[PDB]
CSV table of C-alpha atoms in Angstrom, one decimal:
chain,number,residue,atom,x,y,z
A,1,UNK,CA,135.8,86.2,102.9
A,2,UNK,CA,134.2,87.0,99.3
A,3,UNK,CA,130.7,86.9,97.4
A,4,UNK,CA,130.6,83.4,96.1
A,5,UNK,CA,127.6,84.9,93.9
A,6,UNK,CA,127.0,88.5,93.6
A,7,UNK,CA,123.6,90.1,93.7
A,8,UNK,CA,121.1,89.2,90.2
A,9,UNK,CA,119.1,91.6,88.3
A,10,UNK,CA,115.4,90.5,88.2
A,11,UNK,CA,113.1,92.0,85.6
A,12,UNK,CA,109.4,91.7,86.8
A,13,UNK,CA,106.1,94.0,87.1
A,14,UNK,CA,103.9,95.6,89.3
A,15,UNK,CA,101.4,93.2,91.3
A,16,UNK,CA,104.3,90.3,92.3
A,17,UNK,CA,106.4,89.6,95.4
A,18,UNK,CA,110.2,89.6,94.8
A,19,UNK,CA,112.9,87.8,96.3
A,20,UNK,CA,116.6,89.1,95.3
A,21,UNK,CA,119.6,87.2,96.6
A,22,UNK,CA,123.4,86.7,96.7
A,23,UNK,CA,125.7,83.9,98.7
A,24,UNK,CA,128.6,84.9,101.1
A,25,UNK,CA,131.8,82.6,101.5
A,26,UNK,CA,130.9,82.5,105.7
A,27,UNK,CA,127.6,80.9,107.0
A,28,UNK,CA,125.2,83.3,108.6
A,29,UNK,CA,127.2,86.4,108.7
A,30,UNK,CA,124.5,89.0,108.7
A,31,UNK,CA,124.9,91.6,105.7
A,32,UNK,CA,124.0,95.2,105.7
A,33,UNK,CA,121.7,96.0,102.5
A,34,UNK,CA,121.2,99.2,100.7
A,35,UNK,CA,118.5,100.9,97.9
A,36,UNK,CA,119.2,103.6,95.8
A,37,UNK,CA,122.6,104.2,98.7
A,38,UNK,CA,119.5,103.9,101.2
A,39,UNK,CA,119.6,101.9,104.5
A,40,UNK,CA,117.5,98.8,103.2
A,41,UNK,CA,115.6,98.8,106.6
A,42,UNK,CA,112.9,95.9,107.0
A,43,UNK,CA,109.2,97.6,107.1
A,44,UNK,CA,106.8,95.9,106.5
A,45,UNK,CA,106.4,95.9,102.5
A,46,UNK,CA,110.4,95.2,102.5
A,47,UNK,CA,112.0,92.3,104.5
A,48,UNK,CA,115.7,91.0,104.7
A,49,UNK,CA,116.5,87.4,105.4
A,50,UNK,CA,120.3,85.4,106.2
A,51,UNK,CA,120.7,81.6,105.3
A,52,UNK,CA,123.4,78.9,106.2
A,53,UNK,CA,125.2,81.2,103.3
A,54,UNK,CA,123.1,82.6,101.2
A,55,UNK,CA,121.2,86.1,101.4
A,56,UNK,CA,118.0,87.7,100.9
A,57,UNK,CA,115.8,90.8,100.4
A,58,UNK,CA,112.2,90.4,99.8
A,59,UNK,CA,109.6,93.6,98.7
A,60,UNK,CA,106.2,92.0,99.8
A,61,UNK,CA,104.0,93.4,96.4
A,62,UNK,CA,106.0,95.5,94.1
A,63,UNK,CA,105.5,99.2,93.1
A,64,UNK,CA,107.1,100.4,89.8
A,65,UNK,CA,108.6,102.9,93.3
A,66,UNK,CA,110.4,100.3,94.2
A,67,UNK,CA,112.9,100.1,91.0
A,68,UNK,CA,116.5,101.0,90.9
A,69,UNK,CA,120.0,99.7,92.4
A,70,UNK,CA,120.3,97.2,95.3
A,71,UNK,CA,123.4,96.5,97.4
A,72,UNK,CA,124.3,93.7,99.7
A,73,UNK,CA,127.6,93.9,101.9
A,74,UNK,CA,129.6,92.7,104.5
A,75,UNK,CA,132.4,95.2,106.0
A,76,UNK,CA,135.2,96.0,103.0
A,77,UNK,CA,133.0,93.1,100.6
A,78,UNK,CA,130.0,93.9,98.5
A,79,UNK,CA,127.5,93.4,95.5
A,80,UNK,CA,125.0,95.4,93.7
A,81,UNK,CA,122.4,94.5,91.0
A,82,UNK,CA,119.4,96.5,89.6
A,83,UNK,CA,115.2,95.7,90.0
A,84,UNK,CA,113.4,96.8,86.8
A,85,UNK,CA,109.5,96.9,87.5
A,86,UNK,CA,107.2,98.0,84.7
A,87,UNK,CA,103.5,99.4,85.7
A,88,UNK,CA,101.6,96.7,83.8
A,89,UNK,CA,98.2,96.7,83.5
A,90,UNK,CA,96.2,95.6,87.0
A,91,UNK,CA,94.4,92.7,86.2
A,92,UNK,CA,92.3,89.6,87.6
A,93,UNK,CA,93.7,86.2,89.4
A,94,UNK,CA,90.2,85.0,89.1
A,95,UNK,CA,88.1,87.3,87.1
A,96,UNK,CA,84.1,87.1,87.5
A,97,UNK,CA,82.4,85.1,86.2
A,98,UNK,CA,78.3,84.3,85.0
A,99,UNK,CA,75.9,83.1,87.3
A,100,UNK,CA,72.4,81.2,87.4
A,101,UNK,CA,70.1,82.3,90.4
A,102,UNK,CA,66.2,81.6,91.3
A,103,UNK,CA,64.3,84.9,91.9
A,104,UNK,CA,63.7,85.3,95.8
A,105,UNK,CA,67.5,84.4,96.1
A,106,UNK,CA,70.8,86.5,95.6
A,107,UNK,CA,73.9,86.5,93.2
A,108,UNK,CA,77.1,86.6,94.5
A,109,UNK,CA,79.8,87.8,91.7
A,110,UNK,CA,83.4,87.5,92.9
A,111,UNK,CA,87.3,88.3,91.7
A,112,UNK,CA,90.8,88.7,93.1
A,113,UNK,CA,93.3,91.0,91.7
A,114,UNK,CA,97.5,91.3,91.0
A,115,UNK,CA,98.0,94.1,93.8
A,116,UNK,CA,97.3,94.8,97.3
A,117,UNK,CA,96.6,98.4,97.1
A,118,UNK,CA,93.9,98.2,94.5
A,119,UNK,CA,90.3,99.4,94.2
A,120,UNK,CA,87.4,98.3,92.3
A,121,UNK,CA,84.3,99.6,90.7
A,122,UNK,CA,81.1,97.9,89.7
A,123,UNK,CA,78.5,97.5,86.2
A,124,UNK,CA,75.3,96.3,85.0
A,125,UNK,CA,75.7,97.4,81.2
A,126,UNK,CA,77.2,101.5,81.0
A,127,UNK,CA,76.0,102.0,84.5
A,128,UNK,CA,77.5,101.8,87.8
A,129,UNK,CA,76.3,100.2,90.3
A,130,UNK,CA,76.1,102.2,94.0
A,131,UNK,CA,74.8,100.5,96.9
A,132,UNK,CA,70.7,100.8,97.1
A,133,UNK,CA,68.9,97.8,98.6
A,134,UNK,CA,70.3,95.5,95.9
A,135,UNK,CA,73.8,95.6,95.3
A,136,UNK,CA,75.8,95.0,97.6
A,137,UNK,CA,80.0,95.6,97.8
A,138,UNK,CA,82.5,94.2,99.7
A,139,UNK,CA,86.7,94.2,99.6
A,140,UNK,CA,88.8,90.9,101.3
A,141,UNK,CA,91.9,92.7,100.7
A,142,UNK,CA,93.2,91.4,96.5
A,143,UNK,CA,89.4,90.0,96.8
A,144,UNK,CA,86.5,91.8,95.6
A,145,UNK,CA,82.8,91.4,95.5
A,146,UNK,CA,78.8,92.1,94.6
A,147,UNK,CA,75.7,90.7,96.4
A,148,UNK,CA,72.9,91.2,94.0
A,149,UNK,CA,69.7,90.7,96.1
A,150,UNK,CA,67.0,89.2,94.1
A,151,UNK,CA,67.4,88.1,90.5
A,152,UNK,CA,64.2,89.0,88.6
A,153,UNK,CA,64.0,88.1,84.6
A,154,UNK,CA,64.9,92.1,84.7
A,155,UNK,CA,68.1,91.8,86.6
A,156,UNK,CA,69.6,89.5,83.9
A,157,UNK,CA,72.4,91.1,81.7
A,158,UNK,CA,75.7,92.1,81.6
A,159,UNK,CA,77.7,92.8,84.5
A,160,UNK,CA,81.0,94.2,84.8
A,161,UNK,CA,83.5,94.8,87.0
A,162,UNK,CA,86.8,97.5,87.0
A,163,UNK,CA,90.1,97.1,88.7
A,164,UNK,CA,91.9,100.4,89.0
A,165,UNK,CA,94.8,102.2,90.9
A,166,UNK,CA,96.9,104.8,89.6
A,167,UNK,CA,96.9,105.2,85.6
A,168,UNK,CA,98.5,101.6,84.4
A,169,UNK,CA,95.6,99.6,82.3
A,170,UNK,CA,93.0,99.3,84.2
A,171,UNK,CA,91.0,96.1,83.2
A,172,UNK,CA,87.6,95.1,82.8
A,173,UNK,CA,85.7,91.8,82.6
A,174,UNK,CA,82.3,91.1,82.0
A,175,UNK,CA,79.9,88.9,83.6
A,176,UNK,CA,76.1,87.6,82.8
A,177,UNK,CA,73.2,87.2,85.1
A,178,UNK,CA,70.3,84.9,84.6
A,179,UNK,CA,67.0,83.9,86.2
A,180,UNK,CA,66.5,80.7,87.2
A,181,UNK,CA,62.7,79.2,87.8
């Protein structure tokens, strides 16, 4: 009975799943894990995991909330490491992107973002865009988008769109529109 690798550290960011991990000298003995001296109970955003000897903890989408020391142990044997998680900035996967669309038709802009618990906002120049017969918004969880319903030689310009969640750089990508005959 020993750890035959103790828990690692793992630097990441907001807007990533992370796996931490550690190997026992017994096949799949289950351990009991701990955060911040907390039960490490499995819910949902956090899930723990045994191997043939190795040992897991997974957070599903990491919070900079989710930082700090994690332990790993098995009766009188253990190991601890620490998760440092900055707030980056909440960016695209995808980004928009410009789009060519006859008249009578629509335009169907479309992005995907680093973090499940995100929101978005949509542009045409410095105004925002709120649903009236010709934009139209939709959410597919990290997937966002905007139906524009007709595409008159008026209805070209820059578009934007805005991901945003709490205060951590919220980005911003352009997008043109264009009429095609």
């Amino acid at each position: 009975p020993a750890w035959e690798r103790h828990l690692q550290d793992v630097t990441l960011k907001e807007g990533q799943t992370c796996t931490m991990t550690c190997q026992f000298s017994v096949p799949n003995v289950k351990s009991e894990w701990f955060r911040n001296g907390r039960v490490l109970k499995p819910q949902g955003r956090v899930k723990t995991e045994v191997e043939h000897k190795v040992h897991k903890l997974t957070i599903a989408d990491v919070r900079a909330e989710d930082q700090g020391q994690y332990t790993c142990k098995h009766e009188d044997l253990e190991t601890s490491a620490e998760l440092r998680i900055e707030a980056e900035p909440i960016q695209f996967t995808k980004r928009i992107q410009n789009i060519v669309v006859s008249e009578h038709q629509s335009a169907t802009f479309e992005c995907e973002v680093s973090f499940d618990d995100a929101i978005v906002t949509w542009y045409k120049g410095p105004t925002e865009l709120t649903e009236s017969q010709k934009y139209n918004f939709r959410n597919d969880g990290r997937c966002h988008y905007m139906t524009i319903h007709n595409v008159t030689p008026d209805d070209e310009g820059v578009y934007s769109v805005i991901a945003r969640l709490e205060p951590r750089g919220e980005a911003r990508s352009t997008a043109e529109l264009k009429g095609e005959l």
